[PDB]
Design a protein around this ligand. Structure first.
Ligand SMILES: *[C@@H]1O[C@H](CO)[C@@H](O[C@@H]2O[C@H](CO)[C@@H](O)[C@H](O)[C@H]2NC(C)=O)[C@H](O)[C@H]1NC(C)=O
Lengths: 50, 50
């Protein structure tokens, strides 16, 4: 029981972050390459977030 | 380029008309969705033509 408590404590910061890190650079790659023009910054951002 | 050259007169007229009407090109507010018509499932056979 203590091990599950500790593992859920750890997974709230080491697993909830994995979508974020990939999302951040993926968006910036799209912006740099030209696939996200300045008229689609928020559209693509929130598409990646969801 | 040939496609844009072919449609040059219509696109010039459209640009002039949009600038005169003061429209914003593109669709900001990408989240907007039209509201459901009142009593939609059962009020479909009503004439609303001008
Ligand atoms: C984007 O949405 C924002 C927030 O809803 C809009 O700002 C509001 O615009 C309405 C309509 O003019 C105003 O009544 C509100 O007072 C505005 N709120 C604020 C905090 O400024 C904004 O106009 C929208 N932008 C575009 C380009 O559609």
């Amino acid at each position: 029981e203590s091990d599950i408590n500790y593992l859920l404590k750890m997974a709230l910061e080491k697993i909830a972050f994995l979508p974020f890190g990939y999302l951040v650079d993926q968006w910036r790659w799209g912006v740099f390459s030209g696939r996200t023009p300045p008229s689609r910054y928020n559209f693509d951002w929130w598409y990646l977030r969801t | 380029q040939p496609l844009l050259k072919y449609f040059q007169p219509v696109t010039q007229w459209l640009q002039e008309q949009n600038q005169q009407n003061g429209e914003v090109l593109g669709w900001p507010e990408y989240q907007w969705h039209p509201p459901l018509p009142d009593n939609y499932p059962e009020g479909i056979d009503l004439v609303t033509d001008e």
